[PDB]
């Protein structure tokens, strides 16, 4: 079961297995990992609308977010993944209904 | 709680699941020889 679950989303399996909160992918029959950098809770903004005007009938399938690594660094865009993870890429679009 | 940002992992580090480990069978058990006994004090 652990072999065939890590093929679904390696992030959760690798994090719960190594012990830290790491980001992983699969290189065939092995997992390549990299530690994830924490971000303070109070430094996140959830944008109100999930729609995208340039793509009618399509929408972001998880919330758009903006954040800053340091307490007073610049503001960077991302997208809210599972389990508090911020993807750096705004690509998880669905045809919205 | 906290948030986490996750870089895309380069092929620098590699890990693998530990393979199944053998673990012994039950102890064979003692050889008990029945008998009829008389205990003297």
């Amino acid at each position: 079961l652990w072999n065939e679950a890590r093929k679904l989303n390696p992030n959760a399996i690798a994090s719960v297995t190594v012990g830290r909160r790491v980001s992983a992918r699969m290189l065939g029959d092995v997992m390549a990992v990299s530690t994830c950098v924490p971000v303070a809770a109070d430094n996140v903004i959830v944008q109100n609308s999930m729609r995208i005007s340039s793509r009618p009938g399509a929408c972001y399938s998880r919330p758009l977010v903006s954040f800053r690594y340091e307490d007073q660094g610049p503001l960077v865009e991302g997208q809210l993944g599972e389990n508090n993870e911020l993807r750096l890429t705004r690509d998880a679009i669905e045809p919205c209904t | 709680a906290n948030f986490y940002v996750c870089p895309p992992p380069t092929g620098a580090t590699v890990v693998q699941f530990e393979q199944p480990r053998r673990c012994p069978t039950r102890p064979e058990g003692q050889n008990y020889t029945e008998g009829i006994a008389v205990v003297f004090k």
Partner: antibody
Amino acid sequence: VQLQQPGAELVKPGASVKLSCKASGYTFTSYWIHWVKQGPGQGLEWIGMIHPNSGITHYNEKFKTKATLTVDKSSSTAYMQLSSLTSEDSAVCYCARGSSSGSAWFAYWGQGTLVTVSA
Amino acid sequence: DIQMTQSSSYLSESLGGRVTITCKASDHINNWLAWYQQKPGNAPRLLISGATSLETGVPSRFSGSGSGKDYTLSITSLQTEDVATYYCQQYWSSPLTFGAGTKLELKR
């Protein structure tokens, strides 16, 4: 604290090029490193930023493919790989440090590399 | 996005004169703005770090201020060794944006 750069790079347009900065004085690992491009007399434009400790990049939206950041912790070195060069890309590129405050007001820089993408 | 609109492309003034550059922001920033100077032969220097904050290396002849969307920098005792470009800079949201540059020159 200092940042050492090549003075210039006389590299032909077309094929990609490499650029470096050597850190000195401060702790290279514990401070952000930003990079800013400016032509001759132009308004300087921030080309990207990078955390040496973690390796997390952040590219200006028009510099995913034009440039690619890199960090070698071993030699306290920051790198750009400049891909798809043009003649006008000949410009002064500055690598700069911001404080622990990621406010990045850019106190200390290096001399900056006046890349001359030309033949 | 955030856009810096710098008021004057250049500002020339006689020796020991008084000038006041300014610029505007395309969205409110809450005083997270910086002011730089760059001569052609050096990496740009720092004058203001925070909409109103002087620091070392800039005497009182430089002074910064501002609020909301309008910020400014008043310059006293203009000299022949201050001719350079002056830069608005924001540090509120990536992408970071710099000012176009104001040419502070002489009346000669």
